[PDB]
Amino acid sequence: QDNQTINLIQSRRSIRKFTTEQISDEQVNTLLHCAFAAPSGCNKQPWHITVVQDQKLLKEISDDTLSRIHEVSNVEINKNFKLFYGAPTVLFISYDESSSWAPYDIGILTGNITTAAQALGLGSCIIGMVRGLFTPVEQGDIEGLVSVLDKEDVKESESIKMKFDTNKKYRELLDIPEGYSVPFGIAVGIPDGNLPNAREVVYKVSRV
Amino acid sequence: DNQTINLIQSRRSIRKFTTEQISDEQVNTLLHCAFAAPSGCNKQPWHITVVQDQKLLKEISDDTLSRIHEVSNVEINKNFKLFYGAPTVLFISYDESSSWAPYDIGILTGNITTAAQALGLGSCIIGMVRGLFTPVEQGDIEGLVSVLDKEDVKESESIKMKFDTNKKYRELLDIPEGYSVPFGIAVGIPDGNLPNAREVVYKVSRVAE
Ligand SMILES: Cc1cc2nc3c(=O)[nH]c(=O)nc-3n(C[C@H](O)[C@H](O)[C@H](O)COP(=O)(O)O)c2cc1C
Ligand SMILES: Cc1cc2nc3c(=O)[nH]c(=O)nc-3n(C[C@H](O)[C@H](O)[C@H](O)COP(=O)(O)O)c2cc1C
């Protein structure tokens, strides 16, 4: 329609090419405000957001991710590939894994962020995280370190130590709450070039 | 003064609606918006069932209450409207096969929620319906008891149901096979002026530059 909100929602696409220009603190605040205005089952708001503008840290996550993908699935990705498409800001979304509604809740929250970015003249792409890099240390790493003790110096042994260190490092740097999972981030920036064409939607609908 | 920003920031769950049905074009716009959401791997692993038949909605509402009574001592009065008398309910379902699907479905649900506001409408997500397909959860029951007139609730002994709500609604809502059904969305014309925005809390941390 000629309703501006409807047109953004219907024309949204993922942005994977950004300028080098950082978004303003006011735009960040606005995105956060929008995010935390989402509804949530029982108003628990069982979520957290980490605002990241450290390109070194983002580059490290990108490198570990691509490396893990190469080593586990044996696909070759171009070494110039950027997990976060060079976005100047990324919002890491985490949630309480003991709330039954929480995965849905953070999708709604992510939708608010996505639409708000569009309304500010910005663009985004959601970015899936490798669970193994962000799991809390108590979810499988402890018995890993234990077993490694009786496997003195093997390769599988060195990678268990790195996993633990990586998991500890990323959860601390991002200030992930205890018991929270980090399934994805949202890369946010100023799109470089024209926007991709609107999706031709598919109506996966029944009626009564 | 961006209108889209002010809508997202002022959104509330609406639970009182006029008796006027929304137009087919509104219904279609809500769907178009829903189906424009991002999706992990572009699976778009979702489905919507549009229900405007008040007879069916009553039976769903009743069966949800019966289902609650099966697993606990709480007898909720069948006059209670689970969907707050909304004239349209959108039942959201999805393929558990896709790892990204629960998040996709949240985003789809957000798009619907915001689009409804944009159209002069309002909405409430109704999670209690999942108890028709999966074992009724204790927290859901307490979530619902919290909002009932005390006249609407009594403690009574459990009553076993004659039939399977899961099969019954998987057929009447034409839910694709194996799809999970986490909630319905009640949509309608709000009865009365819009409430104020609520206090927003920032559950946030920051890193560098
Ligand atoms: C996944 C989900 C399930 C919900 N289930 C219900 C429900 O069964 N009934 C209801 O009245 N509200 C339900 N809500 C609405 C919430 O109670 C509401 O979003 C929250 O209390 C905050 O109020 P607000 O939406 O006005 O900001 C649900 C919300 C979500 C996101
Ligand atoms: C949970 C989720 C995870 C996603 N992860 C990625 C990702 O890691 N990389 C990426 O390029 N796009 C990612 N996307 C974007 C989807 O690929 C995109 O929504 C889909 O391909 C359809 O494209 P469109 O959003 O431009 O309409 C993700 C989307 C969601 C909802």
XYZ file of C-alpha atoms and ligand atoms in Angstrom:
479
model
C 0.000 0.000 0.000
C 0.880 3.744 0.316
C 1.291 2.900 4.019
C 5.010 3.389 4.646
C 5.231 0.665 7.368
C 3.516 -1.963 5.184
C 5.772 -1.116 2.284
C 8.966 -1.569 4.360
C 7.804 -4.889 5.749
C 6.786 -6.204 2.323
C 9.915 -4.965 0.585
C 12.473 -6.077 3.153
C 15.491 -7.999 1.998
C 18.783 -9.071 3.633
C 21.627 -6.630 3.115
C 24.988 -8.139 2.548
C 26.937 -5.176 1.161
C 27.517 -2.147 3.410
C 29.492 1.097 3.363
C 32.385 1.536 5.839
C 30.437 4.288 7.636
C 29.455 3.487 11.273
C 25.852 4.025 12.346
C 25.161 6.732 14.963
C 24.663 6.096 18.671
C 21.172 7.484 18.271
C 20.360 4.889 15.598
C 21.801 2.226 17.923
C 19.586 3.452 20.757
C 16.589 3.464 18.502
C 17.213 -0.097 17.358
C 17.530 -1.189 20.995
C 14.456 0.642 22.060
C 12.526 -1.006 19.237
C 13.995 -4.411 20.074
C 13.036 -4.279 23.750
C 9.546 -3.094 22.952
C 8.713 -6.552 21.593
C 6.053 -8.751 23.165
C 7.196 -11.910 24.985
C 5.466 -14.914 26.528
C 4.462 -13.886 30.112
C 6.353 -10.656 29.689
C 9.536 -12.486 30.782
C 11.628 -10.642 28.162
C 14.075 -13.554 28.330
C 16.666 -12.031 26.065
C 19.845 -10.049 25.936
C 21.617 -8.037 23.253
C 25.299 -7.347 22.926
C 26.222 -4.356 20.734
C 29.497 -5.041 18.994
C 31.538 -2.461 17.009
C 34.967 -4.034 17.546
C 36.027 -5.187 14.056
C 38.891 -7.285 15.495
C 36.552 -9.360 17.592
C 34.074 -9.705 14.615
C 36.960 -10.756 12.391
C 37.993 -13.391 14.937
C 34.454 -14.836 15.113
C 34.309 -14.836 11.287
C 37.676 -16.616 11.021
C 36.767 -19.255 13.630
C 33.428 -19.872 12.037
C 34.776 -20.367 8.522
C 37.603 -22.475 9.871
C 35.152 -24.731 11.785
C 32.987 -25.019 8.683
C 36.063 -25.951 6.574
C 37.285 -28.557 9.081
C 33.983 -30.304 9.917
C 32.198 -30.258 6.502
C 35.231 -30.004 4.167
C 33.939 -27.164 1.997
C 36.331 -24.467 0.762
C 35.209 -20.859 1.319
C 37.186 -17.972 -0.232
C 39.537 -16.552 2.445
C 38.265 -13.041 1.621
C 34.704 -14.005 2.847
C 33.352 -11.976 5.792
C 30.767 -13.719 7.985
C 29.266 -10.325 8.866
C 29.609 -8.823 5.380
C 31.788 -6.012 6.741
C 28.933 -4.492 8.750
C 30.169 -1.755 11.083
C 27.808 -2.899 13.954
C 26.540 -6.329 14.974
C 23.871 -7.077 17.602
C 24.405 -10.561 19.187
C 21.054 -11.940 20.373
C 20.925 -14.309 23.328
C 18.113 -15.991 25.171
C 17.176 -18.019 28.191
C 17.263 -21.654 27.190
C 14.943 -22.575 30.072
C 12.049 -20.466 28.722
C 9.772 -22.332 26.407
C 8.656 -19.126 24.533
C 12.070 -17.527 24.340
C 13.146 -18.690 20.847
C 9.903 -17.214 19.439
C 10.321 -14.117 21.583
C 13.711 -13.296 20.172
C 12.483 -13.772 16.634
C 9.851 -11.139 17.323
C 12.504 -8.905 18.842
C 14.718 -9.498 15.764
C 11.784 -8.506 13.537
C 11.475 -5.217 15.402
C 15.181 -4.567 14.955
C 14.981 -5.464 11.222
C 11.993 -3.236 10.427
C 13.401 -0.394 12.539
C 16.714 -0.475 10.687
C 14.758 -0.202 7.424
C 12.802 2.745 8.818
C 16.094 4.496 9.661
C 17.494 4.074 6.148
C 19.791 1.270 7.285
C 19.835 -2.437 6.268
C 20.589 -5.731 8.025
C 21.244 -9.398 7.662
C 20.808 -11.966 10.377
C 23.866 -14.152 10.888
C 23.723 -17.677 12.271
C 26.287 -18.560 14.931
C 28.119 -21.897 15.300
C 26.687 -23.268 18.535
C 29.964 -25.010 19.362
C 31.796 -21.675 19.560
C 29.325 -20.067 22.007
C 28.207 -22.842 24.271
C 28.780 -22.429 27.932
C 31.629 -24.447 29.224
C 29.369 -26.636 31.387
C 27.490 -27.842 28.293
C 29.973 -30.525 27.229
C 33.405 -29.010 27.606
C 34.062 -30.263 31.142
C 33.980 -34.057 30.402
C 35.906 -33.084 27.221
C 38.777 -31.714 29.262
C 38.521 -34.739 31.554
C 38.801 -37.245 28.767
C 41.740 -35.380 27.223
C 43.831 -35.988 30.346
C 43.988 -39.666 29.547
C 44.672 -38.977 25.880
C 47.963 -37.208 26.426
C 48.833 -35.280 23.236
C 46.610 -36.099 20.356
C 45.144 -33.585 17.849
C 41.595 -34.233 19.011
C 43.028 -33.259 22.378
C 44.330 -29.863 21.340
C 40.984 -28.873 19.721
C 39.076 -29.648 22.967
C 41.325 -27.154 24.805
C 40.772 -24.493 22.095
C 36.966 -25.016 22.138
C 36.975 -24.411 25.935
C 39.105 -21.289 25.595
C 37.033 -19.991 22.675
C 33.761 -20.646 24.485
C 34.995 -18.886 27.627
C 36.442 -15.975 25.619
C 33.351 -15.242 23.466
C 30.855 -15.627 26.273
C 32.856 -13.245 28.502
C 33.574 -10.648 25.837
C 29.894 -10.551 24.805
C 28.735 -10.651 28.407
C 26.364 -13.473 27.746
C 24.175 -14.171 30.723
C 24.466 -17.530 32.534
C 22.280 -20.187 30.965
C 21.742 -18.186 27.749
C 22.250 -19.482 24.262
C 23.559 -17.193 21.421
C 21.955 -18.448 18.194
C 22.583 -15.508 15.892
C 23.677 -11.915 15.442
C 22.227 -9.088 13.314
C 24.673 -7.270 11.114
C 23.572 -3.668 10.785
C 24.861 -0.903 8.483
C 24.343 1.604 5.703
C 23.652 -0.344 2.506
C 26.093 0.161 -0.352
C 24.145 0.518 -3.577
C 20.536 -0.051 -4.440
C 18.418 -2.362 -2.355
C 17.651 -5.888 -3.726
C 14.221 -6.300 -5.252
C 11.337 -7.145 -3.050
C 10.592 -10.843 -2.435
C 7.821 -12.369 -4.558
C 6.042 -13.918 -1.605
C 4.705 -17.405 -1.408
C 1.332 -17.792 0.396
C 1.707 -20.822 2.627
C -1.843 -20.500 3.874
C -5.035 -22.510 4.662
C -8.483 -20.927 5.241
C -11.712 -21.691 7.117
C 8.864 11.700 13.786
C 9.092 8.400 11.973
C 5.730 6.610 11.960
C 7.167 3.068 11.753
C 9.519 3.666 14.768
C 6.643 5.139 16.864
C 4.445 2.154 16.090
C 7.030 -0.445 17.123
C 7.844 1.536 20.272
C 4.152 2.008 21.246
C 2.929 -1.493 20.568
C 0.830 -3.296 23.115
C -1.091 -6.552 23.269
C -4.746 -5.753 22.656
C -7.369 -7.857 24.395
C -10.681 -6.084 23.643
C -12.024 -5.777 20.141
C -15.171 -4.476 18.409
C -17.467 -6.962 16.726
C -16.508 -5.714 13.214
C -14.704 -8.257 10.985
C -11.487 -7.131 9.322
C -11.573 -6.847 5.533
C -10.192 -9.503 3.173
C -7.599 -6.971 1.985
C -6.401 -6.449 5.571
C -6.180 -10.214 5.910
C -4.172 -10.351 2.717
C -1.827 -7.541 3.692
C -1.127 -9.306 7.056
C -0.226 -12.448 5.101
C 1.923 -10.691 2.566
C 3.848 -9.109 5.496
C 4.103 -12.386 7.330
C 5.436 -14.139 4.285
C 8.038 -11.409 3.623
C 10.021 -12.237 6.774
C 13.636 -13.340 6.663
C 14.140 -17.082 7.055
C 17.203 -19.196 7.898
C 18.417 -20.864 4.626
C 15.386 -19.355 2.879
C 13.366 -22.400 3.986
C 10.327 -20.316 4.851
C 9.195 -23.298 6.944
C 5.958 -21.841 8.102
C 2.228 -22.008 7.582
C -0.706 -19.900 8.549
C -4.320 -21.010 9.037
C -6.810 -18.096 8.854
C -9.917 -18.714 10.998
C -12.943 -16.375 11.029
C -15.581 -18.962 11.965
C -16.658 -18.046 15.528
C -18.160 -21.545 16.056
C -14.782 -23.177 15.467
C -13.027 -20.617 17.690
C -15.451 -21.354 20.546
C -14.790 -25.109 20.270
C -10.994 -24.423 20.317
C -11.368 -22.149 23.292
C -13.562 -24.712 25.103
C -11.175 -27.611 24.300
C -8.181 -25.643 25.484
C -9.949 -25.181 28.835
C -10.932 -28.883 28.968
C -7.401 -29.766 28.170
C -6.227 -27.704 31.151
C -8.744 -29.362 33.428
C -7.479 -32.882 32.381
C -3.997 -32.226 33.804
C -4.911 -30.142 36.883
C -7.452 -29.110 39.491
C -8.328 -25.757 37.687
C -11.828 -25.577 36.157
C -12.131 -22.495 33.934
C -15.558 -21.280 33.011
C -16.396 -22.037 29.368
C -17.915 -18.519 28.800
C -14.354 -17.160 28.915
C -13.104 -16.196 25.467
C -9.608 -17.502 24.846
C -9.178 -15.184 21.901
C -10.705 -12.121 23.574
C -13.543 -12.122 21.000
C -11.250 -11.320 18.086
C -13.054 -11.890 14.738
C -9.927 -13.316 13.048
C -7.346 -15.705 14.493
C -4.170 -16.737 12.578
C -2.827 -20.082 13.700
C 0.892 -20.242 13.216
C 2.588 -23.559 12.515
C 6.065 -24.647 11.427
C 8.443 -27.384 10.454
C 10.639 -28.434 13.355
C 13.063 -29.998 10.783
C 14.655 -26.608 10.116
C 16.937 -25.591 12.982
C 16.242 -21.876 12.309
C 12.450 -22.277 12.229
C 11.486 -21.077 15.732
C 13.335 -17.860 15.134
C 11.848 -17.505 11.617
C 8.391 -17.926 13.094
C 9.017 -15.206 15.747
C 10.010 -12.799 12.952
C 6.995 -13.753 10.906
C 4.855 -13.132 14.002
C 6.473 -9.743 14.554
C 5.822 -8.723 10.959
C 2.145 -9.592 11.448
C 2.011 -7.750 14.787
C 3.531 -4.568 13.353
C 1.518 -4.773 10.140
C -1.665 -4.999 12.210
C -0.791 -1.797 14.015
C -0.023 -0.134 10.718
C -3.505 -0.974 9.410
C -5.360 0.534 12.383
C -5.680 -2.874 13.971
C -4.428 -4.615 17.115
C -3.415 -8.128 18.163
C -2.615 -10.505 20.957
C -0.467 -13.594 20.602
C -2.329 -16.558 22.186
C 0.143 -19.249 23.355
C -2.354 -21.269 25.325
C -3.420 -23.054 22.137
C -0.206 -25.029 21.956
C -1.623 -27.036 24.841
C -4.066 -28.580 22.356
C -1.154 -30.329 20.517
C 1.405 -30.949 23.167
C 1.211 -31.610 26.857
C -0.264 -28.664 28.734
C 2.414 -26.740 30.516
C 2.126 -25.592 34.099
C 3.458 -22.091 33.454
C 0.844 -21.553 30.729
C -1.891 -22.430 33.168
C -0.622 -20.022 35.746
C -0.162 -17.375 32.976
C -3.832 -17.742 32.099
C -5.215 -17.982 35.714
C -3.391 -14.663 36.426
C -5.691 -12.821 33.997
C -9.162 -14.310 34.901
C -11.930 -12.929 36.915
C -11.834 -14.880 40.088
C -15.544 -15.680 39.431
C -14.365 -17.506 36.295
C -12.144 -20.019 38.141
C -12.762 -22.866 40.555
C -10.647 -25.740 41.885
C -12.204 -29.087 41.031
C -11.073 -32.685 40.341
C -9.531 -33.523 36.973
C -11.721 -34.703 34.118
C -10.423 -36.955 31.314
C -11.365 -36.052 27.773
C -13.331 -38.246 25.406
C -11.137 -37.428 22.370
C -7.727 -36.258 21.044
C -7.458 -32.445 20.529
C -4.159 -32.869 18.642
C -5.708 -35.015 15.871
C -8.910 -33.034 15.865
C -7.172 -29.667 15.297
C -4.380 -30.958 13.087
C -7.254 -31.824 10.684
C -9.635 -28.865 11.189
C -6.755 -26.331 10.933
C -5.192 -28.181 8.012
C -1.834 -28.194 9.795
C 0.916 -29.646 7.566
C 2.149 -32.965 8.729
C 4.579 -32.904 11.609
C 4.391 -29.074 12.002
C 4.474 -27.605 15.517
C 1.790 -25.165 16.443
C 3.062 -22.730 19.087
C 0.307 -20.145 19.156
C -2.494 -18.290 17.460
C -2.609 -14.573 16.810
C -5.888 -12.808 17.636
C -6.507 -9.823 15.376
C -9.238 -7.217 15.331
C -10.274 -3.617 15.573
C -9.401 -2.439 19.044
C -12.442 -1.425 21.153
C -11.423 1.918 22.580
C -8.425 4.192 22.212
C -4.987 2.658 22.212
C -3.136 2.097 25.514
C 0.095 3.929 26.326
C 3.504 2.467 25.647
C 4.977 0.410 28.548
C 8.310 1.001 30.278
C 11.131 -0.449 28.136
C 14.045 -2.168 29.857
C 17.424 -2.478 28.128
C 18.912 -5.983 28.635
C 22.087 -4.937 26.863
C 25.843 -5.041 26.957
C 28.336 -3.218 24.805
C 31.591 -3.925 23.134
C 34.230 -1.365 22.107
C 35.250 0.025 18.621
C 4.990 -16.213 22.422
C 3.967 -15.390 23.156
C 2.894 -16.007 23.777
C 1.902 -15.226 24.407
N 0.832 -15.857 24.926
C -0.138 -15.087 25.407
C -1.397 -15.773 25.840
O -1.678 -16.964 25.778
N -2.333 -14.884 26.207
C -2.192 -13.540 26.306
O -3.143 -12.877 26.749
N -1.029 -12.944 25.997
C -0.059 -13.677 25.524
N 1.077 -13.070 25.086
C 1.196 -11.602 25.219
C 2.113 -11.231 26.385
O 1.505 -11.476 27.668
C 2.533 -9.756 26.317
O 3.284 -9.611 25.127
C 3.406 -9.260 27.484
O 2.661 -9.468 28.687
C 3.827 -7.811 27.425
O 2.669 -6.977 27.229
P 2.585 -6.055 25.874
O 2.460 -7.123 24.643
O 1.286 -5.154 26.016
O 3.883 -5.210 25.835
C 2.048 -13.819 24.461
C 3.191 -13.238 23.889
C 4.096 -14.000 23.190
C 5.266 -13.329 22.519
C 17.831 -17.270 11.803
C 18.432 -16.782 10.509
C 19.770 -16.970 10.264
C 20.366 -16.431 9.100
N 21.689 -16.595 8.935
C 22.235 -16.026 7.872
C 23.705 -16.149 7.729
O 24.347 -16.703 8.577
N 24.165 -15.557 6.618
C 23.413 -14.901 5.681
O 24.005 -14.419 4.696
N 22.085 -14.791 5.817
C 21.513 -15.339 6.871
N 20.187 -15.225 7.034
C 19.409 -14.520 6.010
C 18.645 -15.500 5.128
O 19.562 -16.207 4.276
C 17.618 -14.775 4.280
O 16.579 -14.248 5.089
C 16.989 -15.680 3.211
O 18.048 -16.177 2.378
C 15.982 -14.968 2.355
O 16.609 -13.796 1.818
P 15.953 -12.356 2.115
O 16.078 -12.155 3.708
O 16.902 -11.337 1.402
O 14.481 -12.226 1.730
C 19.580 -15.742 8.161
C 18.212 -15.559 8.419
C 17.654 -15.990 9.605
C 16.189 -15.749 9.870
